[PDB]
């Protein structure tokens, strides 16, 4: 590997703008009171894209990471001529996270998460002796599986029994990853709640989700690559969303390109979607609001079960956090679409015809966003669009393939004993 220097960058909260050195993992500006998330302030001004070998890396003048690690794979744009023609759309523009040879797709976990995961994991000291810790619905508990496994870091992932499917590996994993669960009927956010009390443990520290610059940054490479291969920054970005942190990055990638200036000033404006019935962050904009209206836990987990997609369903969302979804759908003029588990299936089909890859349940929503948007005629046919298909692949890779699943060493119930947790997920890493 390359004579590689760690990206130089300074913090700023973004309530008030402070900015200061990052004492290694901060997640928060310890100064500010109100909720408020910070972000990175790079030196380098100027995206100047590394070449094909360094992978997701590639980016990392705007990736806070200290080393680069082997295996990783960035987002492939393309310009459409299956989905372009069937919605004439003249400059539709598909950023492809997931596994497609074809196109030069290479993430082998099928999601952008792979972003998240080589970003977070490159931020970390290698030095770091205490566990970390992901709760996720599966994709990013997959993206990080991978990752940690193959450069033996102590992971400890909380996904919802639920959800345990999606831990699927080509090969045996590492047992410095172990996973504990929420019972079978939970949803993601009593997964944070797991992972919220076994960091109560010496020992253990959060990525954090959204509050997390480096998946933040990961997940923007997405429209770094898009712009960068497109030659200027999209009308459009459309991307389902489940807490927003890709629409959030988006956001902010924007905000580093038009300071950069070489590739225009314009705002990508953001068309974020979620699955009916689950659709709170869509409710609050449509009134309007920074506050997520009232959310019965039961009905709630209901609804995660109702959806498709069930990276969407998140309780607990970035959205009303300084910094968070709320603030970057005002900033861009955004928009907030629904698509039914139909429309989504739907999406699937038609993706698959005509542009040869199975995606996501999560992909086809947005994707359904997009094919209703037009149908409204909110699109300008000329206006550039950046798709983001934020996981495929998943069929296409299994095939033929004997998987190997991560199970957890412990199902708890959705209010546990802090004491039992603890003292079990001590137990895992002694
Ligand atoms: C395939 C897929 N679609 C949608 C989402 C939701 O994206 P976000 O994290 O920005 O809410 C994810 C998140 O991991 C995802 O993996």
């Given at each position: 590997?390359?004579?590689?220097?760690?990206?130089?960058?300074?913090?700023?909260?973004?309530?008030?703008?402070?900015?200061?050195?990052?004492?290694?993992?901060?997640?928060?500006?310890?100064?500010?009171?109100?909720?408020?998330?910070?972000?990175?302030?790079?030196?380098?001004?100027?995206?100047?894209?590394?070449?094909?070998?360094?992978?997701?890396?590639?980016?990392?003048?705007?990736?806070?990471?200290?080393?680069?690690?082997?295996?990783?794979?960035?987002?492939?744009?393309?310009?459409?001529?299956?989905?372009?023609?069937?919605?004439?759309?003249?400059?539709?523009?598909?950023?492809?996270?997931?596994?497609?040879?074809?196109?030069?797709?290479?993430?082998?976990?099928?999601?952008?998460?792979?972003?998240?995961?080589?970003?977070?994991?490159?931020?970390?000291?290698?030095?770091?002796?205490?566990?970390?810790?992901?709760?996720?619905?599966?994709?990013?508990?997959?993206?990080?599986?991978?990752?940690?496994?193959?450069?033996?870091?102590?992971?400890?992932?909380?996904?919802?029994?639920?959800?345990?499917?999606?831990?699927?590996?080509?090969?045996?994993?590492?047992?410095?990853?172990?996973?504990?669960?929420?019972?079978?009927?939970?949803?993601?956010?009593?997964?944070?709640?797991?992972?919220?009390?076994?960091?109560?443990?010496?020992?253990?520290?959060?990525?954090?989700?959204?509050?997390?610059?480096?998946?933040?940054?990961?997940?923007?490479?997405?429209?770094?690559?898009?712009?960068?291969?497109?030659?200027?920054?999209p009308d459009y970005y459309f991307?389902?969303?489940?807490?927003?942190?890709?629409?959030?990055?988006?956001?902010?990638?924007?905000?580093?390109?038009?300071?950069?200036?070489?590739?225009?000033?314009?705002?990508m404006k953001?068309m974020?979607?979620?699955?009916?019935?689950?659709?709170?962050?869509?409710?609050?904009?449509?009134?309007?609001?920074?506050?997520?209206?009232?959310?019965?836990?039961?009905?709630?987990?209901?609804?995660?079960?109702?959806?498709?997609?069930?990276?969407?369903?998140?309780?607990?969302?970035?959205?009303?956090?300084?910094?968070?979804?709320?603030?970057?759908?005002?900033?861009?003029?955004?928009?907030?679409?629904?698509?039914?588990?139909?429309?989504?299936?739907?999406?699937?089909?038609?993706?698959?015809?005509?542009?040869?890859?199975?995606?996501?349940?999560?992909?086809?929503?947005?994707?359904?966003?997009?094919?209703?948007?037009?149908?409204?005629?909110?699109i300008?046919?000329?206006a550039?669009v950046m798709?983001?298909?934020?996981?495929?692949?998943?069929?296409?890779?299994?095939?033929?393939?004997?998987?190997?699943?991560?199970?957890?060493?412990?199902?708890?119930?959705?209010?546990?004993?802090?004491?039992?947790?603890?003292?079990?997920?001590?137990?895992?890493?002694?």
């Amino acid at each position: 590997m390359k004579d590689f220097t760690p990206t130089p960058y300074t913090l700023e909260c973004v309530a008030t703008g402070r900015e200061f050195e990052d004492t290694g993992w901060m997640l928060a500006d310890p100064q500010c009171k109100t909720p408020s998330l910070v972000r990175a302030k790079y030196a380098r001004r100027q995206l100047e894209v590394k070449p094909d070998e360094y992978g997701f890396y590639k980016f990392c003048d705007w990736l806070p990471v200290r080393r680069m690690l082997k295996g990783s794979s960035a987002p492939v744009t393309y310009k459409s001529k299956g989905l372009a023609r069937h919605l004439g759309l003249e400059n539709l523009y598909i950023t492809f996270n997931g596994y497609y040879p074809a196109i030069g797709a290479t993430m082998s976990t099928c999601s952008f998460k792979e972003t998240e995961a080589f970003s977070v994991c490159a931020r970390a000291a290698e030095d770091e002796e205490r566990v970390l810790v992901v709760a996720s619905a599966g994709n990013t508990a997959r993206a990080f599986a991978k990752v940690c496994s193959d450069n033996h870091i102590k992971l400890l992932l909380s996904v919802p029994y639920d959800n345990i499917e999606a831990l699927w590996f080509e090969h045996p994993l590492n047992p410095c990853v172990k996973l504990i669960s929420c019972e079978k009927g939970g949803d993601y956010f009593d997964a944070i709640h797991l992972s919220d009390i076994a960091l109560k443990g010496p020992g253990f520290y959060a990525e954090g989700g959204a509050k997390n610059i480096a998946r933040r940054d990961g997940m923007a490479t997405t429209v770094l690559s898009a712009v960068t291969t497109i030659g200027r920054i999209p009308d459009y970005y459309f991307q389902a969303v489940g807490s927003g942190t890709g629409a959030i990055a988006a956001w902010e990638a924007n905000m580093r390109l038009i300071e950069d200036g070489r590739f225009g000033s314009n705002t990508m404006k953001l068309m974020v979607s979620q699955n009916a019935p689950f659709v709170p962050m869509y409710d609050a904009w449509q009134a309007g609001s920074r506050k997520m209206l009232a959310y019965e836990d039961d009905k709630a987990r209901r609804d995660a079960e109702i959806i498709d997609a069930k990276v969407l369903s998140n309780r607990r969302p970035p959205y009303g956090i300084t910094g968070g979804l709320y603030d970057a759908l005002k900033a861009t003029g955004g928009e907030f679409f629904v698509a039914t588990n139909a429309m989504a299936r739907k999406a699937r089909k038609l993706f698959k015809e005509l542009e040869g890859v199975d995606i996501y349940s999560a992909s086809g929503v947005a994707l359904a966003s997009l094919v209703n948007a037009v149908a409204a005629g909110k699109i300008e046919k000329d206006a550039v669009v950046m798709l983001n298909i934020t996981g495929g692949g998943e069929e296409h890779f299994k095939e033929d393939k004997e998987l190997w699943y991560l199970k957890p060493s412990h199902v708890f119930p959705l209010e546990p004993d802090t004491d039992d947790v603890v003292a079990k997920v001590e137990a895992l890493f002694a």
